[PDB]
Design a protein around this ligand. Sequence first.
Ligand SMILES: CC(=O)N[C@@H]1[C@@H](OC(C)=O)[C@H](OC(C)=O)[C@@H](COC(C)=O)O[C@H]1NC(=S)N/C=C/N([C@@H](C(=O)O)C(C)C)S(=O)(=O)c1ccc(-c2ccccc2)cc1
Ligand SMILES: [Ca+2]
Ligand SMILES: [Ca+2]
Ligand SMILES: [Ca+2]
Ligand SMILES: [Zn+2]
Ligand SMILES: [Zn+2]
Length: 158
Amino acid sequence: GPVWRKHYITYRINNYTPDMNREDVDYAIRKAFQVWSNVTPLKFSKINTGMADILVVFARGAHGDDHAFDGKGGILAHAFGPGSGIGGDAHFDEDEFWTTHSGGTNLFLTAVHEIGHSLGLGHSSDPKAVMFPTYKYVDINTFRLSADDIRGIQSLYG
Ligand SMILES: CC(=O)N[C@@H]1[C@@H](OC(C)=O)[C@H](OC(C)=O)[C@@H](COC(C)=O)O[C@H]1NC(=S)N/C=C/N([C@@H](C(=O)O)C(C)C)S(=O)(=O)c1ccc(-c2ccccc2)cc1
Ligand SMILES: [Ca+2]
Ligand SMILES: [Ca+2]
Ligand SMILES: [Ca+2]
Ligand SMILES: [Zn+2]
Ligand SMILES: [Zn+2]
């Protein structure tokens, strides 16, 4: 699929979830981007004005992208592939309970995952891969991209 044709990519939080406080949201997202720039020559920059490559949104139900969320459970989030406009944007189902750790849907892991799609990643068949299609809470202390995650992302960006 198309990949971002630039290594300097900006993102912007459009709106905040009420489940976590702001600094926890900011932290999760930022950390989430760091997971991917840690193993690539990509470099992420949060902006607070103007238009970003990747727009992080919290929303419930139908939110204007023709892919409605489904309330609590089922679909947690989706993200659009690299592109202009909605391209690369990552949306989070506000009807999930977003958390810094467990007792909800962990924002950090979920954003590491969506961000991966936002960069043009597919899914993996390794259950230890962050791009694995099934969500499960894993230990963030021992969090690590799998080989499969590393091979895929560096095949798009080096
Ligand atoms: C793409 C594919 O192979 N599978 C189908 C589509 O079939 C096609 C291409 O036509 C199907 O077709 C279309 C375009 O309509 C598509 C649409 O169906 C709906 C209602 O989503 O869904 C695919 N099925 C998949 S992949 N399952 C959903 C997945 N989640 C999303 C995701 O992967 O990011 C995804 C919606 C973008 S998820 O919400 O359940 C999810 C969110 C987050 C983690 C997660 C995981 C790990 C860690 C943290 C977090 C997991 C899963
Ligand atoms: Ca949902
Ligand atoms: Ca975009
Ligand atoms: Ca919520
Ligand atoms: Zn959406
Ligand atoms: Zn996915």
